[PDB]
Amino acid sequence: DMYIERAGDITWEKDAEVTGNSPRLDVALDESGDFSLV
């Protein structure tokens, strides 16, 4: 059945931690909505 509960306001936080790479990846989107590495 499921339900929803609030988690907070949607807002851009001033000095948030910066993480993650910025990778360029060749991928494919099949009919089922799944991505896959080429």
Partner: protein, 155 residues
Amino acid sequence: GETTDGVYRVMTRRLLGSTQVGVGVMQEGVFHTMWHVTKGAALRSGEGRLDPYWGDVKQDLVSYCGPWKLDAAWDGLSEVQLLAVPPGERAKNIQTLPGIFKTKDGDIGAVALDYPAGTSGSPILDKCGRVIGLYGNGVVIKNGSYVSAITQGKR
């Protein structure tokens, strides 16, 4: 039923205890999440049953109580912020510079942020606070690390 904008947790009281299957954006009376989270099933707002309005398995997107209303897009330049809402954890903003998912039908933004299952539907923001997509659909690289697309629907 509630009208408050903001980011929401999608929990599951009956199955394996009140666990978190995903996250969602409420805006302009419409709830947005990723399809594999709800499977296009109607949801509960405590007092109001929210029914799916539009759905797309290919885009992995569904909306409730109205059409998809998020149309802000990544500028292919700026750094973004994943408003991550992990299971059993307080919401937090995570700044990053998106990578790129290269497909035959063009390129879309992708964020290299690794968060547990149940975080799907977490909004990705631009520096104006506008949701430019949802987190939770992507790939796993050789590292075992995770890269999610910045999944955005049409308005």
